[PDB]
Amino acid sequence: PKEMLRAQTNCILLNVLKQGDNYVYGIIKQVKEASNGEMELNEATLYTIFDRLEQDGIISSYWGDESQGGRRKYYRLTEIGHENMRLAFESWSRVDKIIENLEANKKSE
Amino acid sequence: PKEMLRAQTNCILLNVLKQGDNYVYGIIKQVKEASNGEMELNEATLYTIFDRLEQDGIISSYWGDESQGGRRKYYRLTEIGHENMRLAFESWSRVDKIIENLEANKKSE
């Protein structure tokens, strides 16, 4: 779907922030880099997601670069956010185990 | 969260049907089997999901033939449903590549 896309886009984003705090264009560049140019995120899309995540307590922002040229919003993964990433990762690898078992449980029958 | 679980239950369920057509208690048993008893799915929750998937054209149901003891409802993964599974699988493995790259791109720097 386009929902499929939105969960997939969240994952990538959180994994960017996981590598380090960052700002919009910084984040977009890493995605472009790590997708060999294929995935080009939008500012609007990134911010739309980042607003949701911020409210739900997954990420927090803060100001920087006041002295560099002008204010920039940076984003960071909260302690809750780190936990939920670990939880998601744990759960999905668990889903992978269950799925491989279902394919062996068919050989059994 | 809750909406993470729903996404996982879904993944498991579609992968059960992927192994073959099946009915509710048959499905529940396979999940219990393949999760070493950890995941015991609820009928209401399974049907709630199965109604959504059926409406969106992802799965169809039908009656067994050899149903003297009483009618048995089977479930089956549609054409569309198979495609979406292939799409999802393709996309998520792509997401995994992008994620591994992000972690190497940071090791570099």
Side-chain angles (χ1 to χ4, degrees), chain B:
Chain B
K2 200 171 183 67
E3 201 207 355
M4 178 195 68
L5 183 61
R6 175 203 178 182
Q8 290 164 353
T9 297
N10 263 259
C11 205
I12 291 157
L13 290 173
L14 304 144
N15 271 267
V16 167
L17 298 182
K18 190 91 197 313
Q19 304 321 303
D21 285 10
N22 203 322
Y23 80 109
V24 168
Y25 289 122
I27 288 160
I28 291 176
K29 177 186 199 209
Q30 283 236 69
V31 171
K32 201 173 183 280
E33 222 112 83
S35 73
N36 316 288
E38 287 175 357
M39 197 178 305
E40 306 186 23
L41 298 176
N42 215 250
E43 294 102 323
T45 298
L46 190 147
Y47 277 115
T48 296
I49 293 163
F50 270 18
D51 284 354
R52 285 167 197 157
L53 293 170
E54 191 158 30
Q55 275 208 35
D56 299 351
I58 309 297
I59 59 174
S60 63
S61 53
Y62 62 86
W63 301 111
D65 44 5
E66 221 157 18
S67 285
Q68 171 191 339
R71 334 202 303 287
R72 181 86 45 89
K73 179 173 282 167
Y74 283 78
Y75 282 93
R76 181 194 75 93
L77 202 37
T78 69
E79 160 67 16
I80 290 167
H82 280 99
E83 182 67 340
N84 297 9
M85 286 193 64
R86 192 193 61 80
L87 287 172
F89 172 85
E90 192 181 341
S91 295
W92 280 108
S93 78
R94 182 44 171 161
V95 167
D96 288 2
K97 245 197 298 305
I98 287 170
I99 284 161
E100 86 189 334
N101 288 340
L102 292 175
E103 306 180 344
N105 283 357
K106 188 176 65 110
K107 261 264 281 177
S108 184
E109 312 242 2

Side-chain angles (χ1 to χ4, degrees), chain A residues 4 8 12 15-16 19 30 33-36 38-39 91-92 94-95 98-99 101-103 105-106, chain B residues 7-8 11 15-16 19 30 33-36 38-39 91-92 94-95 98-99 101-103 105-106:
Chain A
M4 194 63 60
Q8 280 173 351
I12 289 161
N15 273 267
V16 167
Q19 303 322 304
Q30 285 220 75
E33 217 168 277
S35 75
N36 318 289
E38 289 172 32
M39 194 180 292
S91 296
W92 282 108
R94 182 45 169 183
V95 166
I98 288 171
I99 285 162
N101 290 338
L102 293 168
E103 308 208 24
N105 278 11
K106 183 177 182 194
Chain B
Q8 290 164 353
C11 205
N15 271 267
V16 167
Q19 304 321 303
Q30 283 236 69
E33 222 112 83
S35 73
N36 316 288
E38 287 175 357
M39 197 178 305
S91 295
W92 280 108
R94 182 44 171 161
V95 167
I98 287 170
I99 284 161
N101 288 340
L102 292 175
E103 306 180 344
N105 283 357
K106 188 176 65 110

